[PDB]
């Protein structure tokens, strides 16, 4: 896979963000991140993307938009994956794979196990 540049336009919620991507505005849904702490997840994502000096989007090898026209990607802020950071913090669960987008699934499951062991936030 590869990372592509994007500019934050607006934080929306724990697993949704609006970015300028290839000179066009687009709502992105964070791949493989489920949010049942909803306000907590929102604040966490908001801070991570607003404080970033560099935001990148990384599509996976499966379908790239959902039925609502949202881009389905891994989002990075200064190189750190937001999807994984939310799962590792116990602020989201790992979702079911959607349409072949599973590159980072195993890695996210490891983060989720560790958050669960630590009884963090949703795993309280």
Burial (Cβ within 10 Å: 0-12, 13-18, ≥19) of residue 98: middle
Q: Say what the resolution is, in angstroms.
A: 1.8
Strand 16-21 and strand 71-77: the pairing is: unpaired
Q: How was this structure determined?
A: X-ray
Write the CB contacts of 52 (distance below 8 Å, at least 6 apart in sequence).
8, 77, 78
DSSP state string for 79-101: TEEHHHHHHHTTSSEEPPP-TT-
- The domains located in the chain, with CATH, are 1-124 (2.40.50.90)
């Amino acid at each position: 896979l590869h990372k592509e540049p994007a500019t934050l336009i607006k934080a929306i919620d724990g697993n949704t963000v609006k970015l300028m991507y290839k000179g066009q505005p687009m709502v992105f849904r964070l791949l493989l991140v489920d949010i049942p702490y909803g306000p907590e997840a929102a604040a966490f994502t908001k801070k991570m993307v607003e404080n970033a000096k560099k935001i990148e989007v990384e599509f996976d090898k499966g379908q790239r938009t959902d039925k609502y026209g949202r881009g389905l990607a891994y989002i990075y802020a200064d190189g750190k994956g937001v999807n994984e950071a939310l799962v590792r913090q116990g602020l989201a669960k790992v979702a079911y794979v959607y349409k072949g987008n599973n590159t980072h699934e195993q890695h996210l499951r490891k983060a989720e196990a560790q958050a669960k062991k630590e009884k963090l936030n949703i795993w309280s």
